[PDB]
Amino acid sequence: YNYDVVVIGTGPAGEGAAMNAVKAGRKVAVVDDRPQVGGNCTHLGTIPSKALRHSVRQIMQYNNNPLFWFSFADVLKSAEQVIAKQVSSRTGYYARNRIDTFFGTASFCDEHTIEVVHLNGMVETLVAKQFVIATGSRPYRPADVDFTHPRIYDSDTILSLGHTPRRLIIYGAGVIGCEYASIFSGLGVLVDLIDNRDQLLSFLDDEISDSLSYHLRNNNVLIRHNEEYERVEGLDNGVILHLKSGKKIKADAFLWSNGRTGNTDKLGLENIGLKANGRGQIQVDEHYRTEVSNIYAAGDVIGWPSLASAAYDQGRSAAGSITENDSWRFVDDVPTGIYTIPEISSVGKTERELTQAKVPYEVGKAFFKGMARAQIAVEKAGMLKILFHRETLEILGVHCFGYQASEIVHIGQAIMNQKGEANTLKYFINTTFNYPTMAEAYRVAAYDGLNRLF
Amino acid sequence: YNYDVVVIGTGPAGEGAAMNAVKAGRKVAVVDDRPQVGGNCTHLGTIPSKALRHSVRQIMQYNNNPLFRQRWFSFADVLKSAEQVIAKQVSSRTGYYARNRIDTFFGTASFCDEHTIEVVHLNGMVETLVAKQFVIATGSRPYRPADVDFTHPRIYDSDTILSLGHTPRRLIIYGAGVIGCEYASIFSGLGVLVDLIDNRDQLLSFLDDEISDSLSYHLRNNNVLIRHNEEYERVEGLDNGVILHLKSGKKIKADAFLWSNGRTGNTDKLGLENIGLKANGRGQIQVDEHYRTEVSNIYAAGDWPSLASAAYDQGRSAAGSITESWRFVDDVPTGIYTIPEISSVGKTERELTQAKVPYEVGKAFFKGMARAQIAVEKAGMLKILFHRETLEILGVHCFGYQASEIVHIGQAIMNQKGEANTLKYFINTTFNYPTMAEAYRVAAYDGLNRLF
Numbered sequence A: 001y002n003y004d005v006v007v008i009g010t011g012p013a014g015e016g017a018a019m020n021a022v023k024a025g026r027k028v029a030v031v032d033d034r035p036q037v038g039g040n041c042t043h044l045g046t047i048p049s050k051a052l053r054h055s056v057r058q059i060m061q062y063n064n065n066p067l068f069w070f071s072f073a074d075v076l077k078s079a080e081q082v083i084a085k086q087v088s089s090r091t092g093y094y095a096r097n098r099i100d101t102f103f104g105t106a107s108f109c110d111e112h113t114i115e116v117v118h119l120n121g122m123v124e125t126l127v128a129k130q131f132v133i134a135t136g137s138r139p140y141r142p143a144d145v146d147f148t149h150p151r152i153y154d155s156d157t158i159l160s161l162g163h164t165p166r167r168l169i170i171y172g173a174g175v176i177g178c179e180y181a182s183i184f185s186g187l188g189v190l191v192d193l194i195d196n197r198d199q200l201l202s203f204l205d206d207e208i209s210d211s212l213s214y215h216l217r218n219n220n221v222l223i224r225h226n227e228e229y230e231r232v233e234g235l236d237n238g239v240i241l242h243l244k245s246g247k248k249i250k251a252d253a254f255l256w257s258n259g260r261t262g263n264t265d266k267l268g269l270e271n272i273g274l275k276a277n278g279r280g281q282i283q284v285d286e287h288y289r290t291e292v293s294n295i296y297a298a299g300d301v302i303g304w305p306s307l308a309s310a311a312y313d314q315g316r317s318a319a320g321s322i323t324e325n326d327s328w329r330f331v332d333d334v335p336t337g338i339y340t341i342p343e344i345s346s347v348g349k350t351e352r353e354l355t356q357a358k359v360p361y362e363v364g365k366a367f368f369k370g371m372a373r374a375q376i377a378v379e380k381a382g383m384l385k386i387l388f389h390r391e392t393l394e395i396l397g398v399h400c401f402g403y404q405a406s407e408i409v410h411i412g413q414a415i416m417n418q419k420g421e422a423n424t425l426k427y428f429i430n431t432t433f434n435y436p437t438m439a440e441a442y443r444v445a446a447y448d449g450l451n452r453l454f
Numbered sequence B: 001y002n003y004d005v006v007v008i009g010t011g012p013a014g015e016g017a018a019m020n021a022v023k024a025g026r027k028v029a030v031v032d033d034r035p036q037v038g039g040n041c042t043h044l045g046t047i048p049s050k051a052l053r054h055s056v057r058q059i060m061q062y063n064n065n066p067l068f069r070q071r072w073f074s075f076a077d078v079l080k081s082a083e084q085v086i087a088k089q090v091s092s093r094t095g096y097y098a099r100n101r102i103d104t105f106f107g108t109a110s111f112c113d114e115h116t117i118e119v120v121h122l123n124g125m126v127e128t129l130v131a132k133q134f135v136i137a138t139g140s141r142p143y144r145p146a147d148v149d150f151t152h153p154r155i156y157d158s159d160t161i162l163s164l165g166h167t168p169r170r171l172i173i174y175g176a177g178v179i180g181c182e183y184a185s186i187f188s189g190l191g192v193l194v195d196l197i198d199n200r201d202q203l204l205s206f207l208d209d210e211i212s213d214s215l216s217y218h219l220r221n222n223n224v225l226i227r228h229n230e231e232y233e234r235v236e237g238l239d240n241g242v243i244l245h246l247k248s249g250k251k252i253k254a255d256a257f258l259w260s261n262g263r264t265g266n267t268d269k270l271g272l273e274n275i276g277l278k279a280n281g282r283g284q285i286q287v288d289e290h291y292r293t294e295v296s297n298i299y300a301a302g303d304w305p306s307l308a309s310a311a312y313d314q315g316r317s318a319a320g321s322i323t324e325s326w327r328f329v330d331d332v333p334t335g336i337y338t339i340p341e342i343s344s345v346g347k348t349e350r351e352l353t354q355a356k357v358p359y360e361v362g363k364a365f366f367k368g369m370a371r372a373q374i375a376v377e378k379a380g381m382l383k384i385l386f387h388r389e390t391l392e393i394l395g396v397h398c399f400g401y402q403a404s405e406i407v408h409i410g411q412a413i414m415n416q417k418g419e420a421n422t423l424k425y426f427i428n429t430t431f432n433y434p435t436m437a438e439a440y441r442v443a444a445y446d447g448l449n450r451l452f
């Protein structure tokens, strides 16, 4: 077969790259080893975890509702229709713009031709001028951990759970680990989160991390800091983890969420002259182009920031660079978002970086406890913090935690991206929002900032 | 994949073998290289030629009927009618396969060992299939000599002739076989000066002399020019017409050319040397009375006599032998579908004369037949050879419209044993009237007059 742009993997990066390329008028093909389109964006990652989290939140609201346990399988059963709808929508998207697909593992043979091998023994060959690599990553699996044990799971096999455990252990304080800890705590299981550092999500703001830790501890998430595993043992009834500090923790299950490794082992990277680091990531430039001129890598496969929306935008920019239609833009200022119960999101500098850089900033706070919308939604916990320059009133950082955090942070991001005097805090006083909504926070927050300035 | 019986070829032999094997309760599968089921019987051989012949008969009757006068048509329009029949037949065969839970694999089959095969499709496929019992029904192809340019647009065979787009003014057919005679009759009915070339001095020497003479007379009266005892020397394809130079020194120029001399077995691609099976010069496979090859678990059936019904029966017999219903297909009623048709069963007059059997001949001419007169097909003849003393039937020959359907009553009477196989049955049995089966009765009486 002959094409112009060939995409590996149908994740957000691959889908975005292929759509931008077909928007340019080229002839484009996509290859994905999964039997269905979507990848970890919909099959094992974002969609199943988010459906589980939303079901857990609804269960929690129902239990605490004055108007009125649940098996894990019943809770997870809400995700199959969502994934079916998403895969149908993406299949229709691909069919309408006429992109041919191949459901098989893709391997490299030269600079222009690839081998697609399916489960039947199918062998096909694709040739194109431009290639996009969006193989993503897989859960990092250390050798000394018996993942074949029925009671030991990773970020993928955890969905195979057939019963809600009495206790559980989570290793790694990453985004996935914290999200799963929050979800399981909502389900009503004593989760023992294990962290290699002293503070949860040290890249976040200190206040937000402290509030998240307080809520997790108040919701049975026993958090142990500064820990490194020594030896994991699987039994008939439970799993026992011996830490290097000497503590032995026994649970009825086990989940590993410490890092991810890029999918490059089966790609045959040596056949083209490219090499991947120990993390399985491919070095790319500001154009998302590797050392090979016609080879482009984008999305989570490159490592940072390993965010599905960020991966989609990175693939879109890589396709724009391939077509050179001015649509390229290096995706660097990604607003971080952690989907625990409740949510967390941030955009821009934190208070620690601002303190280090000696920027004369000021803090405006808005607490969700005194909020009409938050109380009406029965969400008492949460806060919103805005860091703004004292003199120029420019917003240098927005951090929110609580109800609808990710949706709230977008307006602060939009105000942030303005240039010069346009990016000012006083906008929140010169613009009328709706009421009662969560956006009203900004208004209050703005005042709580400008009252601190003399 | 694992199965009990694996058949190669979806023609009548393969389909019959698969159906008989699946009737035994085993798990069976079929493989073929054609993108549709049916085999050469439906896609390139029997069915298209029969549709062409029936359409030619219909247009001939329409032209000759005074009622329809108050009109030559292109070859493509005549051939168009076969597509519907082919589609219906392939749909019926696919339904038969699916209702019986038969696995089909559309790719060329190659032998690896005595129990497994590789299936390769157009796109570099590889599929392994292992089964206890195997059936070979690969059929055959038109024989292609090296010294003729089949790639020439004006030179065709028994398969590529359907690719003709325009009806030629003149045409040459080489080989006086059943296929050659049928195509010569069809093209003569279409209104083309056909120059049939025969290697021997008599058309269809395996038939009775009277039947062959009548067929030759009809072909001569239908613009077909028959040349006897000729062998080709060189076929040259010009831009306007094909010129054939024969060994006798003649040169014949026409607007087309058809080759129908011999058939070649489709065994080269099978790779039988990987299992210890050899193919002769014609590509056939030697088998015993049980349709079994040298290998104990390898069986071959179908494409002598290269008859579709005979191939079907041979395939079913091979399947029965595999499942332990076996019957050696040896006596097949020979049928040539020219205009009019020809059929024969049992011994001919020449063989009876050689063996000095005291027989007698009963004739019933179709010219005096009422149903034949209504059919406006008066040319015909029904000859019955019956033993004089014991009144047993030793041979039945017919040459006329609806010959194949007529011959089956004589065949049914033939297969009876002893006194049951008697000509007097045709005297003591009430037939339908007006039918050409009742002609048998007349023939029987025409025999009983000669008795004394």
Ligand SMILES: Cc1cc2nc3c(=O)[nH]c(=O)nc-3n(C[C@H](O)[C@H](O)[C@H](O)COP(=O)(O)OP(=O)(O)OC[C@H]3O[C@@H](n4cnc5c(N)ncnc54)[C@H](O)[C@@H]3O)c2cc1C
Residues within 6 Å of the ligand: A008, A009, A010, A011, A012, A013, A014, A031, A032, A033, A034, A038, A039, A040, A041, A044, A045, A046, A049, A104, A105, A106, A107, A134, A135, A136, A137, A155, A176, A263, A266, A267, A298, A299, A300, A301, A306, A307, A308, A309, A310, A311, A312, A339
């Ligand atoms: C539990 C969980 C929750 C998450 N929640 C979020 C969230 O809320 N927001 C967010 O932004 N991110 C989230 N993520 C991260 C998200 O999974 C990634 O950011 C996203 O997958 C990045 O897009 P991608 O296309 O690079 O990844 P993928 O979608 O994983 O791309 C890899 C695709 O390529 C295929 N592939 C891989 N190797 C080959 C090969 N050799 N041959 C052929 N095909 C191949 C894979 O089968 C897959 O289809 C979450 C992750 C997890 C585990």
Ligand SMILES: Cc1cc2nc3c(=O)[nH]c(=O)nc-3n(C[C@H](O)[C@H](O)[C@H](O)COP(=O)(O)OP(=O)(O)OC[C@H]3O[C@@H](n4cnc5c(N)ncnc54)[C@H](O)[C@@H]3O)c2cc1C
Residues within 6 Å of the ligand: B008, B009, B010, B011, B012, B013, B014, B031, B032, B033, B034, B038, B039, B040, B041, B044, B045, B046, B047, B049, B050, B107, B108, B109, B137, B138, B139, B140, B158, B179, B266, B269, B270, B301, B302, B303, B306, B307, B308, B309, B310, B311, B337
């Ligand atoms: C013009 C014409 C008219 C005819 N008219 C009549 C008639 O009126 N009556 C009659 O009884 N007979 C007639 N025949 C003869 C008839 O074609 C054969 O008798 C019969 O079809 C053979 O049956 P078969 O299944 O054994 O062979 P086929 O029907 O040829 O079956 C072979 C099948 O297997 C496939 N195949 C071949 N090699 C391989 C391979 N290596 N791997 C996989 N698949 C393979 C072929 O493509 C084909 O589909 C006629 C023939 C011709 C050419």
